[PDB]
RNA sequence: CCCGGCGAGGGGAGUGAAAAAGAACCUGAAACCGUGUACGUACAAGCAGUGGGAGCACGCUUAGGCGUGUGACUGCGUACC
RNA sequence: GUGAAGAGGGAAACAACCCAGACCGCCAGCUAAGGUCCCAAAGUCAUGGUUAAGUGGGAAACGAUGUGGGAAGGCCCAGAC
RNA sequence: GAUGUCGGCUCAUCACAUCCUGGGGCUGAAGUAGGUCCCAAGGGUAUGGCUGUUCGCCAUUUAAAGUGGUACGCGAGCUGG
RNA sequence: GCUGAAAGCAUCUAAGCACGAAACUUGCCCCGAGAUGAGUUCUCCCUGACCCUUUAAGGGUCCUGAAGGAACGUUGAAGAC
């Protein structure tokens, strides 16, 4: 239920190993307006694959 | 002797002229090419690779493609492996269509079992419920004691508890077989095999006899 | 001044092939884990590897006194609930020879890190023969 | 003056002997938590040190073969009240 | 007598048993109990016997042409067993 | 300055002084079926009525319904008669 | 049990030889080269130019970015992730 020994900033560490986050590996660049998003999603302009999406 | 790898198409019935009603699985084996043939002097054991099927041309990779053209094969979905039993001979590029099965009369097949995820003791290991009345608090369906007192003071390695259940390497063995069609390239086996519709399944004959 | 000691990276290490026919295990055993230890190396250091190679020959050939032949057992647990298993000294013979004078030779050296290294110096084969030729191994009348 | 939401919080400028005295303000210890550098660490079993000890890094030196950090491997070794 | 209030070496580990009483330092020598084929420091030492059971390395009444040694006796080339 | 007590439930694991199945000697062993001893632990080894019961008696099955160790196994798994 | 001495006989045993059980090793099914003793077989890919220096399994710049992989998307009789 509990610990019997208080486990060693070692310990900590070592289970954190796999909380690191991942960074995207590219951003795909639109082929009309130049700008950077995210892959198979709208600009923040409302572009997608240079078909200029609705931006209302 | 060396077996066939086919595909589960499904399952349906024959019926016989004395009124009995066979169930049957239809299993359909296409021509198995021979991509590889293994000798004793380069690999240490007898044994031929076989391929089946059609892939996407724009899918097999380099390696793989080199390893079809040097035998002069059209690329399959998969290769699998058949020991040889000390009087067969095989040549690459060679054929093998169903009927090998032609005079077999029982066979060995074995697939990949549908997968349950993961699965209670309960289901898995048939274990007991416990009551569902009666004062029970919250141990409806826990498997309940896991060991010994201090003695062992360890659960024992194979305990069974609840885990992945399915989805693993399962043979059937001594299946009937019923018919061989080579025309449609099919094969009826008596009864249930491993693995769900259109799955690959490997047939020998039976090793029991 | 200080005591000499050996440096694992100048040391020097010879070959030599043994020939196990006919030979009693445990004598020979011996011999072996001396050697590969390095005892009789005036270099000798309890912290440095300092033994040669040795390579046994014909090892399902070996000898042992009296009725150990067939009453010798090996035993193992294999980590399971059942777990215990043996094996005389003749089903080892028949099975896996090698494992013979590899299993004395390994409870004859010291258990740690380095006796395990040290271990890796021994190769055994059951055979005459061996495909070691490239290191001109030297016939050892042990 | 600048970034920021006419924010919070900062970077300059200026005041002062001092702003690492900026109001969460003299001095600013320890537990505890971080960034950088050197070395060790993914076939090895236990009060984690001690005796021996290679290699690597670095400071020296009229090569002076010493000092400092690290510690592969090895003998011994079951905290305190 | 020892432990208690006593460390060191030996008995695998083992306050009370065996050896032996630590003022400090030494990378010098001789011994005690106990030991000398390898783990693991030192005799694969020398001479004459015993054991074949891994006895050695767990045990009784009792049982048995196992085997070694010793002192006597009965019957025997008038031919024994 | 706390090691929770019988019974049941769930889940077990080992021993062999063996309940069934397997292999043998003797028999006051004709056969069928038994008695006794030796070898053997691979697998298998009842459901109900009464009682909190373990046990026991009773009813009816089974090739057999074995004997013991595991904190008289198992309440940080359930129950609470 | 066979043959057979020690012991002229006898004797399954001392030399030698043959039978003998659900136990043992295999045969059947599954996992399995982290088997650091890290194995084997087939196929595929990469065929630039310079500089510094404590000069070696050394460091750096430019050019180059293959086989393949990953990521993302549509998803599955695969799945807690």
Known sequence: ?56 | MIGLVGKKVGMTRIFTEDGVSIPVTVIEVEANRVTQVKDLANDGYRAIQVTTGAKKANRVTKPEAGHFAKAGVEAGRGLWEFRLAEGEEFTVGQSISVELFADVKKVDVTGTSKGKGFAGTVKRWNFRTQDATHGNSLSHRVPGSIGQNQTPGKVFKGKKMAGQMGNERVTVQSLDVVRVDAERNLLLVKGAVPGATGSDLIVKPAVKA | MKTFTAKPETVKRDWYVVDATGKTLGRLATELARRLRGKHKAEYTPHVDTGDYIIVLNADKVAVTGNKRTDKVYYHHTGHIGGIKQATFEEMIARRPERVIEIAVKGMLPKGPLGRAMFRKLKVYAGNEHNHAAQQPQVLDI
Do not use: F
Not at chain 1, 19 to 26: C, I, K, Q, R
Not at chain 1, 29 to 52: F, N, P, Q
């Open chain 1, 1 to 56: 239920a509990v610990q019997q020994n208080k486990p060693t900033r070692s310990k900590r560490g070592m289970r954190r190993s796999h909380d690191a986050l991942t960074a995207v590996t590219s951003l795909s660049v639109d082929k009309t307006s130049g700008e950077k998003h995210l892959r198979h999603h709208i600009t923040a302009d409302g572009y997608y694959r240079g078909r200029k999406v609705i931006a209302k």
